[PDB]
Amino acid sequence: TVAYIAIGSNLASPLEQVNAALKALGDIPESHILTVSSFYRTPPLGPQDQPDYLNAAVALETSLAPEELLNHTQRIELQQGRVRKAERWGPATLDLDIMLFGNEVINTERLTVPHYDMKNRGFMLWPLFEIAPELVFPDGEMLRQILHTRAFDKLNKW
């Protein structure tokens, strides 16, 4: 099954963090990285000069069950980042989100696929469209269509 995973970092050298996260993701059992997007740059909300976010998307072929994949992504986040409690409202060392898992729809306390609000987050959709321009969401909506009809500025590259 192809899982699409969102990667985000705005602390401790994001280029270093995304690269470590990619390596970790690549090591997950019964899984293989199919494709990686370019790295995008998402500035913060606010003028106060806060660190920009590096965002990416990964196509991960996997024979794992969705909750099994989640066990590894959470593990990776916990081992590589999640250093201070403030990161939940503020800058983060590493965020790993499972965006999509094949055409599955999943709503458990643990795991919600498609990811919460992802259709309204260009920092997710732009890199996903780079690697999967023909993608169709589980409800039948085309990703391309979503980007042609919602108010997303083009994200600049890192």
Residues lying near Cl ion in the complex (CB under 5 A):
15, 114, 137-139
17/73 with CB nearer Cl ion: 17
User: How many Å separate Cα 138 from the centre of its chain?
Assistant: 17
137/152 with CB nearer Cl ion: 137
Shortest gap between Cβ of 117 and Cl ion (angstroms)?
Answer: 12
Does residue 123 contact residue 40 with C-beta atoms inside 8 Å? Answer: yes
Phi, psi for residue 29 in degrees, rounded to 5:
-60, 150
Shortest gap between Cβ of 65 and Cl ion (angstroms)?
Answer: 20
Shortest gap between Cβ of 139 and Cl ion (angstroms)?
Answer: 4
Cβ neighbours of residue 62 closer than 8 Å, sequence gap 6 or more: 1, 2, 3, 28, 30, 31, 32, 69
28/124 with CB nearer Cl ion: 124
15/78 with CB nearer Cl ion: 15
Shortest gap between Cβ of 100 and Cl ion (angstroms)?
Answer: 8
Helix (H, G, I), strand (E, B) or coil at 85: helix
